Design a protein around this ligand. Structure first.
Ligand SMILES: *[C@@](C)(CO)[C@](*)(O)[C@H](Cc1ccccc1)NC(=O)[C@H](Cc1ccc(OC)cc1)NC(=O)[C@H](C)NC(=O)CN1CCOCC1
Lengths: 235, 240, 231, 231, 243, 244, 222, 212
C-alpha cells in the first residue's frame, strides 16, 4: 500500500483529494448570506419511505449565533460539531462573550489535517457554517477536510453543487431580503433534487441577530414552498 | 501500539473497509423491527443448519440494554457483544449522572458514535454489525425504533429490517405498513412482523424469535408455541 | 517512481521525491512578492478566490510587532508554521526580553521542516513562506522552502508565475534598495513587481494584499479600500 | 526545599554618570566558620555586564555555568555575536529572573540574591536585582544582605534620585563604594577584608579589579575603652 | 530485488544501498574543504550565487560547535544543521558532566554514532551530508571528515562535494611539498586557492568565498571567521593563482 | 518504513469476511476431533490425540482435555500452545470471580470473557488470532449442565451435543441421528466413542490415542465431580462398549 | 523551611469616571524594614486601553501582568486583531488566577479602562480570581486606610441632604478628572503618613478614549 | 454570607445578602451572590468567593452544552449533580462552597438542591446556607406556611436576610430577591440594608432591641 499523508506528483495530498470525492456523493446543502440574515437549507434524501424523515438531522446548532449544515459522510460530522460546540461555549466561559464566526470556523478546520500515522483518515464531510457577530456581521463559511475555509456570499455543496453554484452566481445580489433568500434556496434545491421537493424531504433554517439560529418547522416551510410555486406561475 | 490506518479513502471516494463491513451485515441472519400504535416488536431469524443446539443457554439474538430499551442486530456475533457491553455501561452511567434512564435516541446516538470512531481510528477495523434499537423513553408512551450501521449513521424508522434477504422483507413492509394507521394492537403488530419474516425464513418452527416491548419497562419474549400459533393462523388465511 | 512512497526513502540519484512533491504544491499556489530597502521591508501578495461569490484567501500572517510572513501553497501548513514562529518570537520576549532575530527565525523554521523529512509516518510541509522583519541589524527578507532551505535576500517571489516578478526585482535591485525613509514608494516598487506575474487578471481592491514593517513602523497589513491608493 | 550551606555575603552597587559600579568580598562562609577565602563572586558576561551573586555558593556556581553556557549558545549561528546581536545586560537579567521564579514555583529555589550590573548598547546604565523568590526591582543603588541595611544609606547620600546620576562622577562613585565595603567589614560578622570591584563604563568599557583590601581603618580609639560601665 | 527501497536492509553484497544513495545527494552539493595546519585547522566552502538578490555575507554555511569546534558540510543543508544541533547537545552534556570542553576525537565519535544510528532502522532516513569538522584541544589540532554511513577518519586534508577530486589533488600536493608542516595563515591562503580551483567544476553561477579557522597562536584556540582585510588578502592570492 | 511488511491481520475481505479468522478455522479443521455430549445427569468429553507414536508417554500427558476449575473443563482443537495461553487466562478469570463474589463462576460468564478476548484479536492490535476452538463443559446452579463452543472469531454458542476439529460435518450428522433428550451419561459415553470410531482417520480406535472425561453429579448428594480418565480406565470403557 | 511568599508592600487605587478611568499606585518597593526601590512602577499599560496592577508579592505580581500582557497578544492573533473588552479581560484574568487556586498568586489585582458603551470601568480581584466591577477600589497594604475614604467621597456614603431630617440621601453623580486626581493625591498622602510601606512617589495612569496618559507626584520618603 | 431559598404554593423564593469578607475586613458590600444559569435556573453562592464564582460559572457552561447536545433544558437534578460530582473530585483539596441550585422544569416542577464542597447533595423545600444561616432560619421557619402569597413570600425572604444581615457580623450590604415560577425566574430588585432596616423597623414595629 502507501502512506496516509503522502503527496501526489501534482502536489496534493491523496487522502484529502479522495475525501472530496466522497463529499460530491453526499446530499445537497445550500447557504445564502444577506444583510437581514443567513439562510441554510438541505436535501434530506431518505433512502426508503419507511424511514421517518424528521429524524434526519443535517442542519445543526453550534451556538445561539452560529448554525451548521453538512454534506457527505454525515457520521464524521458528529465529532466536528461536538468540538465546535465545546469551542464556542469554552470561549464564552474564558472571555464572557460570543465567539467570532471566523474563529469558530478556524477552530473546526484545525481538526481537519490532524490525521496520519491523531485520527487515521481525513473527515469525509464538508460543512457550511453560518452565523453572526458584532464585528463582521452576517457570515457564511465553507469548511473542507483539507483544513481550508472560504467565506461566501452564497454557496452550494453536495451532489448538485456545481449546477446550483452557477445558479447562485446569477441570482445573488447585495440587496437580497431574507424572504427572497428563503425562496431562492427552495427554488435551487427543487431544481437539483431527484425526488419532488416538499416539506418532508427538504429542510430550511436561518440565523438572524434578533432571534438567533432557528430550524424551521415543516408547517412554515410548506407555506414558503406554496408561496414559491405561485410566484413562478405569476409570470 | 498498533497504529496502521486500516479504514482509508479510495480514488473514487469510498472507504472500502466500512463498505466491506456492510457485506458482513448482509451475510448475517435477518432481523426486523416494526412499531405499532402502543408497542414495538423485534423479530429475528435463526438459521436451521444448527440442530442439537441448547436454546436455554445459547446467546439470545435480542439483548436488553436497560429495562426499557432493547437491541437486536445483524452481522458478526462476536462484534455485537462489544457494542452491547459498551451500551449497557453507558446506560448505567447516564442513570448515575443525569438521574434518569437514557432516551432511545440518546442510546442509539452513543452506539452509532462508537461505530463511527472505529472508522477513523488507527489500528482498528470497523464493526461488522448493524443494529436495531427499540424502546420507550422514560414516562413516555410514544414507540421508538432506530437503526445504526458500521459507518456510524443512524436514523428513526416506522418499520425496518436488516441482514440477509432484508431487501425482500423491506419490500413487503413498504406496501403492508400504513403510516396513517399503524398496527393498533399488540396482536396486529406481532402478526405483521411474523408475516414479514415468513417471506424469507423457511419454516415457522424454532427459526423465528419474537420480542415484544411495551411502555414502562414491559418487555417479554414469546415462546415456541405462542409464535407457532401466529404461523398456523397466517398460513390458513393465505390459502384463499 | 518506486522511491516516492514516503519521505524516509532516497532515490538512486539521491533525491527525496516527497519533498519535491511538496515543493510542487508551492508552484500551484498564488503569487506573492517580497522586497526590502535599508529602512523598510515589504510583502505584496496576490489573493485568490474560489469564485465571484467567495472571499479571497488571506495570504499574509503577522508573527510579532516586528515580524511576519506571506504564504504560498497549503494554507493550513502556513498556519502551523506561523503559529510556531509566534511562539518562538514570544518565548524570546518573555524569557530574554529580546525581540527574536529574523535570522534565528529562519534557522528555527529550517530545523522544524527538516525533522519531518527524515522520519517515517510524517510528511513534509506543503507551503513556502516569505518572512520579513526589522530587528537590531536593520530590515530583512527571508525565503523559506519546506525542504528546509532558508535564504536571506534583498528581494524575491514565490508561487505561480513568480519568475516574472523575480526577474524585475533582479533588474530593479539598485533602485529599490536605496528607497530609504519612504514607505509608499517601496510599496509602489513591490506592486509594480507583482504586476509582472499577472495574466488576464489585474489588481483590484479586494484582490491585492500588502504588508509592511520598518524602522518606525510595526508589522501591519493592508486590505480592502486601504490598498486602493496603489492601483 | 533547601537550606544554604556555603554562603556569600553582601553585594553592593550603584549608577554614575557614564556607567555602573559593583563590588563583593571574596569570602565563602560555612556558617560561623570563615572557610574559603579565594572565592570570586563577581562574574563578567561579555565586555558589558557583571553579575554579582550572594547566598549559596553551590547555587552560585550553577548560575556561573548557566551564564557561561548562555554566551556559547548566543554565539551559535550568529555572525553579529560580538556586535549588534551581543548579549545585553537586560537579556542576561530577564533570563536569570525567569529561572529564579520558575525554581521558587517548583518549591526548589536557587538560594541566592543577584544583582545584574551593566551598560546597554544605546549607552543606558542597567542595574537590577533578583532573588530566590523571583522578586525583581531596580534603583540607582542596589545591595544584598547587610549591604541593603548599611551600604544603601551611604550610597543614597550620593545618588538619592534619578536626577543625581549625571551629577556623579566615577571618582566620587568608586570612593563611596570602597567606603561602604569598609563599613561592612567593621560591622558584618560574615565579611572579609579582601574584595573585588568592577566598573562598567560606556566609554572606557569593563574594568575588573581583583585583590583589593579595606584600608584607612579607624581602630586607635579602642585603647581608651575600658570595661562595660564602671571600671 | 527491492533491496534499495528500505533503509537498514543488507543487499546480497552486504551493502546498504540507501546509504550509497544518500552519498549521491552529497556529491550533488557544493564544494567544501578542511586543511590541518601547524597548530590548528582551516575550513572553507563554496557558496553559489544563484541571483543578484542574495545578500552578500549574509547566508552563512559554516557552523560553530561549543567555542572551539568548526563544522562545514556538503549536500542537504538542513540535514547538516540537524547534525550540528545534535553535536551542540552532545558537546554541552560532555562539558556539563566532565567540565573540560569536549575533545575533537570524542566529539567525532558522538556524531559518528548518531549518523550510524540512522542506518540501523527503516523508520529513519540516512543523513544526506558529508561533514568536515575539527578544532584544537589539549592534544593539539585535529581534522575529521564524517560520511552518511557513519564512517569517519582523521585527516591531514579533507574535501567533499561536486569538486572533491580537484580539491583532493590540490590537497595532496600540499602534503608532499610541506612535510615539516603548513602555517595557519598560509593554510587560509591555500584554502582560498583550492576553493577557486574547485569552482571550475561548478562554473555556471559565480560564487562567494567563506573561510573560518581555529589556531592555537592566531585565534587563541577558538573558532573564528576570516573577515575583512585577511579575507580580501586570501581572495587576491587566489585570484593571482588562477591567472 | 515498516508498513511494507504488515500483513494487516484485522481487516475485511470484499465479501465481508475476516481473512485471518477464516484461515484459522481451516487450520483447526485438521486438528484431532473433539466431541462433547450433554446428558440429563452429566456431560461427556471425548477427544482424539493427533497421530500418536509408540514411544510417547501416554499416562503423564495432556493435549486435548484441560481443567479450568472444579466445575468447568475444556476440550481443545488447534494449536496447543495457543490454547494454554487462553486456558491460564480463563483459570485466572474464574479465580477473580470467586475472590470477588465468593461464588464459583457461572459457565456462560467465563465462556463470554474468553470469547471476548479472541474477538479483540480480530478487531484491533494487528496481531494474528488464536488458532483454537474450545468445547466448554461445565455446571452451575442456574442452568445446570452446559455445553458451549468458541472459535477464533470470538463467537460462542450453546449445544446439547457438538464436535470440533476434523470431520465435524460427518460427526455432527451421526450425533444428530442417535441423540435424544432423555439420555443418560453412560449412554452418552457410548455415543461419544461410537462417533469417534466412525469418523476417525486412523485404522482402529485404541486406548492410547484417546483422552476422555466426564462431569457427573455421581458424587455423594448434590455435588459435581470431574473425572479425567486414566489410560487403563479408557482401555476398560473401550472393551465394555465392545469397540475392541 | 523555605517560604515561597514575600510581602513587597505598597498600595494601589482605581477610580472610574463618566468617560474616563484612573489607576494609581505608589512607586515604593520594600522587604521587611528595608526600602528596595523608591521608584519601581507597578501600574502597567497592557494595550487595548487596559491598565493593570497586581499589588502584594511583586514576583507573583510581575508574573501575572506578564501573563495577561501575553494573553492580550494571543487574543489578537487568534481573533483577527479584535479589541479585548474590559469585561472580557476581567474574565480572562479570573482563569489565570484560579489556575493557581491551590498555590495562589499573592496579589490583589485591579484593572481599569472603558466599557463598550465608552463609560469608565474598574474591575478588582482577590488572589484566587474572584472579581467585581465597581466605581471605586483601593488595593494592597493601605487598602484598609484608603477604601472607607473613597466610600465617603466617591459614592457619597453616610452623606445626607442637609435639612432633610436624614431622609433624603446625597445624590450620586460622576466626578471630573480634576476632582478624581485630587482625591487620589489626598488618599496617597494620607496613607503615606500612617503606613510605613507606602511613600516615595505616586504614579497615576489615566485612561480616556484618546489613550493612556501618565502623571507622577512626589511622596514623603521616610 | 447568608443565602436562602424556599418552595411554596406560588413557586420558589430565593434571597441572598451581598457582603464579602477577608477576615474582619469588609471586602465588599455590593457582591452578586446569585448566578443566573439560564432563564429557568438559579445558583446561590456561599463560602469561598472565587470557588463559588468560578465553578458556578463553569456549571453554566456545562448546562449550555447539555441543551446543545440533547436539544432540551437540563434538569435541576442533573445540573446540581454535575456540580456535586465536580467538587467531590476536589474533596480534601480545600474548596469551600455552600450552594443551592434552584429552578423549574416540566418533569420536576419547582425544585431546590443543596450542594456543598464536601460532597453533600440534598433535595428539599427549605434551605439556608452561609455564616448567618441560623439567623435566617429563625425568622423563616417561624413564619413559613405553604399557602403564602407571592407578595408575602417575597417579603418573608427579604425579611429573613435582613434579620441575618443585622445579627451576623459576616453578612449584610444589601438584599437581592428572585422569584422562580413555571415561566422562569423574575428579578425583584436590590434592597440596601442602609434604608431597608429603618423602613422595616418603622412600618413593622420590629427590631425593638435597636435604639430608634
Ligand atoms: C459570607 C460573607 C462569609 O464569607 C459569604 O460566605 C461570602 C460569599 C461570597 C460569595 C461570592 C462572592 C463573594 C462572597 N464569602 C466570602 O466573602 C469569602 C469568605 C471566605 C474566605 C475564605 C475562605 O477560605 C476558603 C472561605 C470563605 N471571602 C473570600 O473568599 C475573600 C474575598 N477571598 C479570600 O479570602 C482569598 N483567599 C481565599 C482562600 O484562598 C486564599 C485566598
Amino acid at each position: 500500500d502507501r502512506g496516509v499523508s503522502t503527496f501526489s506528483p501534482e502536489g496534493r495530498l491523496f487522502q484529502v483529494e479522495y475525501s472530496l470525492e466522497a463529499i460530491k456523493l453526499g446530499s445537497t446543502a445550500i447557504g445564502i448570506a444577506t444583510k437581514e440574515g443567513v439562510v441554510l437549507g438541505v436535501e434530506k434524501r431518505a433512502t426508503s419511505p419507511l424511514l421517518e424523515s424528521d429524524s434526519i438531522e443535517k442542519i445543526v446548532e453550534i451556538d445561539r449565533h452560529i448554525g451548521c449544515a453538512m454534506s457527505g459522510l454525515t457520521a464524521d460530522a458528529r465529532s466536528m460539531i461536538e468540538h465546535a460546540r465545546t469551542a464556542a461555549v469554552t470561549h464564552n466561559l474564558y472571555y464572557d462573550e460570543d465567539i467570532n464566526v471566523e474563529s469558530l470556523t478556524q477552530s473546526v478546520c484545525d481538526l481537519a489535517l490532524r490525521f496520519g500515522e491523531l485520527m487515521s483518515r481525513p473527515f469525509g464531510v464538508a460543512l457550511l457554517i453560518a452565523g453572526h457577530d458584532a464585528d463582521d456581521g452576517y457570515q457564511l463559511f465553507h469548511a473542507e477536510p483539507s483544513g481550508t475555509f472560504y467565506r461566501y456570499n452564497a454557496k452550494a455543496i453536495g451532489s448538485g453543487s456545481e449546477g446550483a453554484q452557477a445558479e447562485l452566481l446569477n441570482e445573488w445580489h447585495s440587496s437580497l431580503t431574507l424572504k427572497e433568500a428563503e425562496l431562492l434556496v427552495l427554488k435551487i434545491l427543487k431544481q437539483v433534487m431527484e425526488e419532488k421537493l416538499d416539506e418532508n424531504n427538504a429542510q430550511l433554517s436561518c440565523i438572524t441577530k434578533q432571534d438567533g439560529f432557528k430550524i424551521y418547522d415543516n408547517e412554515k416551510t410548506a407555506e414558503l414552498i406554496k408561496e414559491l410555486k405561485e410566484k413562478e406561475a405569476a409570470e | 501500539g498498533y497504529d496502521r490506518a486500516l479504514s482509508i479513502f479510495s480514488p473514487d471516494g469510498h472507504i472500502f473497509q466500512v463498505e466491506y463491513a456492510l457485506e458482513a451485515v448482509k451475510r448475517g441472519t435477518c432481523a426486523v423491527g416494526v412499531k405499532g400504535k402502543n408497542c414495538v416488536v423485534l423479530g429475528c431469524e435463526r438459521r436451521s443448519t444448527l440442530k442439537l443446539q441448547d436454546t436455554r443457554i445459547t446467546p439470545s439474538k435480542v439483548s436488553k440494554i436497560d429495562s426499557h430499551v432493547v437491541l437486536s442486530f445483524s452481522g458478526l456475533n462476536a462484534d455485537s457483544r462489544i457494542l452491547i457491553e459498551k451500551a449497557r455501561v453507558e446506560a448505567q452511567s447516564h442513570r448515575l449522572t443525569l438521574e434518569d434512564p437514557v432516551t432511545v435516541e440518546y442510546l442509539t446516538r452513543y452506539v452509532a458514535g462508537v461505530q463511527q470512531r472505529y472508522t477513523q481510528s488507527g489500528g482498528v477495523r470497523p464493526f461488522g454489525v448493524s443494529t436495531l434499537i427499540a424502546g420507550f423513553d422514560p414516562r413516555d408512551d410514544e414507540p421508538k425504533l432506530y437503526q445504526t450501521e458500521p459507518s456510524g449513521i443512524y436514523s428513526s424508522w416506522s418499520a425496518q429490517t436488516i441482514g440477509r434477504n432484508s431487501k425482500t422483507v423491506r419490500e413487503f413492509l413498504e406496501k403492508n405498513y400504513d403510516r396513517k394507521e399503524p398496527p393498533a394492537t399488540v396482536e396486529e403488530c406481532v402478526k405483521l412482523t411474523v408475516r414479514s419474516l415468513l417471506e424469507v425464513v423457511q419454516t415457522g418452527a424454532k427459526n423465528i424469535e419474537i420480542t415484544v416491548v411495551k411502555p414502562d419497562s414491559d418487555i417479554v419474549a414469546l415462546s415456541s408455541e405462542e409464535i407457532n400459533q401466529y404461523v398456523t393462523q397466517i398460513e390458513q388465511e393465505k390459502q384463499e | 517512481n518506486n522511491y516516492d512512497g514516503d519521505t524516509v526513502t532516497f532515490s538512486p540519484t539521491g533525491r527525496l521525491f516527497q519533498v519535491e512533491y511538496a515543493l510542487e504544491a508551492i508552484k500551484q499556489g498564488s503569487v506573492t512578492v517580497g522586497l526590502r530597502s535599508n529602512t523598510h521591508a515589504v510583502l505584496v501578495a496576490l489573493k485568490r478566490n474560489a469564485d465571484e461569490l467567495s472571499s479571497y484567501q488571506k495570504k499574509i500572517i503577522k508573527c510579532d510587532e516586528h515580524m511576519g510572513l506571506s504564504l504560498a501553497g497549503l494554507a493550513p501548513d502556513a498556519r502551523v508554521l506561523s503559529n510556531y514562529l509566534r511562539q518562538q518570537c514570544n518565548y524570546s520576549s518573555l524569557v530574554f526580553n529580546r525581540k527574536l532575530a529574523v535570522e534565528r527565525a529562519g534557522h528555527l523554521l529550517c530545523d522544524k521542516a527538516q525533522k519531518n523529512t527524515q522520519s517515517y509516518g510524517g510528511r513534509p510541509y506543503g507551503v513556502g513562506l516569505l518572512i520579513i522583519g526589522y530587528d537590531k541589524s536593520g530590515a530583512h527578507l527571508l525565503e523559506f522552502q519546506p525542504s528546509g532551505n532558508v535564504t536571506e535576500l534583498y528581494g524575491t517571489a514565490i508561487g505561480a508565475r513568480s519568475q516574472g516578478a523575480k526577474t524585475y526585482l533582479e533588474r530593479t535591485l539598485d533602485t529599490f534598495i536605496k528607497i530609504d525613509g519612504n514607505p509608499d514608494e517601496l510599496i509602489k516598487a513591490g506592486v509594480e513587481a507583482i504586476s509582472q506575474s499577472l495574466r488576464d487578471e489585474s489588481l483590484t481592491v479586494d484582490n491585492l494584499s500588502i504588508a509592511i514593517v520598518g524602522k518606525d513602523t510595526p508589522f501591519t497589513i493592508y486590505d480592502g479600500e486601504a490598498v486602493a491608493k496603489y492601483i | 526545599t533547601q537550606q544554604p550551606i556555603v554562603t556569600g555575603t553582601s553585594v553592593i552597587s550603584m549608577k554614575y554618570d557614564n556607567g555602573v559600579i559593583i563590588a563583593a568580598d571574596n569570602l565563602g562562609s560555612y556558617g560561623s566558620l570563615l572557610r574559603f577565602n579565594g572565592v570570586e563572586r563577581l562574574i563578567p558576561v561579555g565586555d558589558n555586564t557583571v553579575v554579582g551573586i550572594s547566598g549559596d555558593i553551590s547555587d552560585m556556581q550553577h548560575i556561573e555555568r548557566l551564564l557561561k553556557d548562555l554566551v556559547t549558545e548566543n554565539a551559535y549561528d550568529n555572525p553579529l555575536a560580538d556586535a549588534e546581536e551581543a548579549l545585553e545586560p537586560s537579556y542576561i537579567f530577564e533570563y536569570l529572573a525567569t529561572v529564579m521564579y520558575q525554581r521558587r514555583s517548583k518549591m526548589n529555589p536557587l538560594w541566592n540574591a543577584i544583582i545584574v550590573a551593566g551598560v546597554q548598547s544605546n549607552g543606558d546604565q542597567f542595574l537590577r536585582y533578583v532573588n530566590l523568590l523571583g522578586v525583581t526591582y531596580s534603583s540607582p543603588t542596589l545591595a544584598t544582605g547587610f549591604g541593603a541595611h548599611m551600604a544603601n544609606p551611604l550610597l543614597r547620600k550620593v545618588v538619592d534620585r534619578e536626577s543625581d546620576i549625571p551629577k556623579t562622577t566615577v571618582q566620587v562613585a568608586e570612593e563611596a563604594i570602597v567606603n561602604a565595603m569598609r563599613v561592612l567589614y567593621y560591622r558584618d560578622a560574615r565579611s572579609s577584608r579582601n574584595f573585588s570591584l568592577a566598573i562598567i563604563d560606556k566609554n572606557t568599557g569593563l574594568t575588573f579589579k581583583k585583590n583589593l583590601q579595606v584600608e584607612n581603618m579607624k581602630w586607635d580609639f579602642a585603647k581608651d575603652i575600658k570595661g562595660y560601665g564602671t571600671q | 530485488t527491492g533491496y534499495d527501497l528500505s533503509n537498514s536492509v543488507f543487499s546480497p553484497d552486504g551493502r546498504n544501498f540507501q546509504v550509497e544513495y544518500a552519498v549521491k545527494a552529497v556529491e550533488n552539493g557544493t564544494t567544501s574543504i578542511g586543511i590541518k595546519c601547524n597548530d590548528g585547522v582551516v575550513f572553507a566552502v563554496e557558496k553559489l550565487i544563484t541571483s543578484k538578490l542574495l545578500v552578500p555575507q549574509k547566508n552563512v554555511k559554516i557552523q560553530v560547535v561549543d567555542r572551539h569546534i568548526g563544522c562545514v558540510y556538503s549536500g542537504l543543508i538542513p540535514d547538516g544543521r540537524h547534525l550540528v544541533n545534535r553535536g551542540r547537545e552532545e558537546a554541552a552534556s560532555f562539558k556539563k558532566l566532565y567540565k573540560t570542553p569536549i575533545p575533537i576525537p570524542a566529539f567525532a565519535d558522538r556524531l559518528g554514532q548518531y549518523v550510524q544510528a540512522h542506518t540501523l532502522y527503516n523508520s529513519v532516513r540516512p543523513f544526506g551530508v558529508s561533514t568536515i569538522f575539527g578544532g584544537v584541544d589539549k592534544n593539539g589540532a585535529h581534522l575529521y571528515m564524517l560520511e552518511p554511513s557513519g564512517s569517519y577518519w582523521g585527516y591531514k586534508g579533507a574535501a567533499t562535494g561536486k569538486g572533491r577530486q580537484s580539491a583532493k589533488a590540490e590537497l595532496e600536493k600540499l602534503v608532499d611539498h610541506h612535510p615539516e608542516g603548513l602555517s595557519a595563515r598560509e593554510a587560509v591562503k591555500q584554502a582560498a586557492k583550492i576553493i577557486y580551483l574547485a569552482h571550475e567544476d561548478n562554473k555556471e553561477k559565480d560564487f562567494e568565498l567563506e573561510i573560518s579557522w581555529c589556531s592555537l597562536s592566531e585565534t587563541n584556540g577558538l573558532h573564528k571567521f576570516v573577515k575583512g582585510d585577511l579575507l580580501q588578502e586570501a581572495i587576491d592570492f587566489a585570484q593571482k593563482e588562477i591567472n | 518504513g515498516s508498513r511494507r511488511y504488515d500483513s494487516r491481520t484485522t481487516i475485511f475481505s470484499p465479501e465481508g469476511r475476516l481473512y485471518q479468522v477464516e484461515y484459522a478455522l481451516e487450520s483447526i479443521s485438521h486438528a484431532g476431533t473433539a466431541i462433547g455430549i450433554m446428558a440429563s445427569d452429566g456431560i461427556v468429553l471425548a477427544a482424539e490425540r493427533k497421530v500418536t507414536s509408540t514411544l510417547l508417554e501416554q499416562d503423564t500427558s495432556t493435549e486435548k482435555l484441560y481443567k479450568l476449575n472444579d466445575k468447568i473443563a475444556v476440550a481443545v482443537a488447534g494449536l496447543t500452545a495457543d490454547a494454554e495461553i487462553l486456558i491460564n487466562t480463563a483459570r485466572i478469570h474464574a479465580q477473580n470471580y470467586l475472590k470477588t463474589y465468593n461464588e464459583d463462576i457461572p459457565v456462560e460468564i467465563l465462556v463470554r470473557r474468553l470469547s471476548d478476548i479472541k474477538q479483540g484479536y480480530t478487531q484491533h492490535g494487528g496481531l494474528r488470532p488464536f488458532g483454537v476452538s474450545f468445547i466448554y463443559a461445565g455446571y452451575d446452579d442456574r442452568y445446570g449442565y452446559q455445553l458451549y463452543t468458541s472459535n477464533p472469531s470470538g463467537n460462542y454458542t450453546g449445544w446439547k451435543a457438538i464436535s470440533v476439529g476434523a470431520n465435524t460435518s460427518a460427526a455432527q450428522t451421526l450425533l444428530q441421528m442417535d441423540y435424544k433428550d432423555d439420555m443418560k451419561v453412560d449412554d452418552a459415553i457410548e455415543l461419544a466413542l461410537k462417533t469417534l470410531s466412525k469418523t476417525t482417520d486412523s485404522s482402529a480406535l485404541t486406548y492410547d490415542r484417546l483422552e476422555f472425561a466426564t462431569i457427573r453429579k455421581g458424587a455423594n448428594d448434590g455435588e459435581v465431580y470431574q473425572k479425567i480418565f486414566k489410560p487403563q480406565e479408557i482401555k476398560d470403557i473401550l472393551v465394555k462398549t465392545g469397540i475392541t | 523551611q523555605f517560604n515561597p511568599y514575600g510581602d513587597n508592600g505598597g498600595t494601589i487605587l482605581g477610580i472610574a469616571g463618566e468617560d474616563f478611568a484612573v489607576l494609581a499606585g505608589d512607586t515604593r518597593n520594600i522587604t521587611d524594614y528595608s526600602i528596595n526601590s523608591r521608584y519601581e512602577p507597578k501600574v502597567f499599560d497592557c494595550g487595548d486601553n487596559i491598565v493593570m496592577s497586581a499589588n502584594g508579592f511583586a514576583a507573583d505580581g510581575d508574573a501575572l501582568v506578564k501573563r495577561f500582557k501575553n494573553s492580550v497578544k494571543w487574543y489578537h492573533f487568534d481573533h483577527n486583531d479584535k479589541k479585548l473588552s474590559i469585561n472580557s479581560a476581567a474574565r480572562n484574568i479570573q482563569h489565570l488566577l484560579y489556575g493557581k487556586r491551590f498555590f495562589p498568586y499573592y496579589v490583589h489585582t485591579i484593572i481599569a479602562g472603558l466599557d463598550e458603551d465608552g463609560k469608565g470601568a474598574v474591575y478588582s480581584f482577590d488572589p484566587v480570581g474572584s472579581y467585581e466591577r465597581e466605581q471605586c477600589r483601593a488595593g494592597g497594604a493601605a487598602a484598609s486606610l484608603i477604601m472607607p475614604f473613597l466610600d465617603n467621597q466617591v459614592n457619597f456614603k453616610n452623606q445626607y441632604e442637609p435639612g432633610t431630617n436624614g431622609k433624603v440621601k446625597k445624590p450620586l453623580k460622576y466626578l471630573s478628572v480634576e476632582e478624581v486626581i485630587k482625591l487620589v493625591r489626598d488618599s496617597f498622602t494620607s496613607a503615606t503618613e500612617r503606613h510605613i510601606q507606602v511613600g516615595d512617589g505616586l504614579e497615576i495612569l489615566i485612561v480616556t478614549k484618546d489613550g493612556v496618559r501618565k502623571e507622577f507626584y512626589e511622596l514623603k520618603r521616610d | 454570607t447568608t443565602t436562602l431559598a424556599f418552595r411554596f404554593q406560588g413557586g420558589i423564593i430565593v434571597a441572598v445578602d451581598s457582603r464579602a469578607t477577608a477576615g474582619n475586613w469588609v471586602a465588599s458590600q455590593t457582591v452578586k451572590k446569585v448566578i443566573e444559569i439560564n432563564p429557568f435556573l438559579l445558583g446561590t453562592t456561599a463560602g469561598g468567593a472565587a470557588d463559588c464564582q468560578f465553578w458556578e460559572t463553569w456549571l453554566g457552561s456545562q448546562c449550555r452544552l447539555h441543551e446543545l447536545r440533547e436539544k432540551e433544558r437540563i434538569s435541576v437534578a442533573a445540573a446540581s449533580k454535575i456540580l456535586s460530582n465536580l467538587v467531590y473530585q476536589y474533596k480534601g483539596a480545600g474548596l469551600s462552597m455552600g450552594t443551592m441550585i434552584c429552578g423549574y422544569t416540566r418533569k420536576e416542577g419547582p425544585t431546590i438542591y443543596y450542594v456543598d464542597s464536601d460532597g453533600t447533595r440534598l433535595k428539599g423545600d427549605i434551605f439556608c446556607v452561609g455564616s448567618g444561616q441560623t439567623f435566617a432560619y429563625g425568622v423563616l421557619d417561624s413564619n413559613y406556611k405553604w399557602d403564602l402569597s407571592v407578595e408575602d413570600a417575597l417579603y418573608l425572604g427579604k425579611r429573613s436576610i435582613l434579620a441575618a444581615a443585622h445579627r451576623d457580623a459576616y453578612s449584610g450590604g444589601s438584599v437581592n430577591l428572585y422569584h422562580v415560577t413555571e415561566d422562569g425566574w423574575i428579578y425583584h430588585g436590590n434592597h440596601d440594608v442602609g434604608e431597608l432596616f429603618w423602613k422595616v423597623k418603622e412600618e413593622e414595629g420590629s427590631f425593638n432591641n435597636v435604639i430608634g
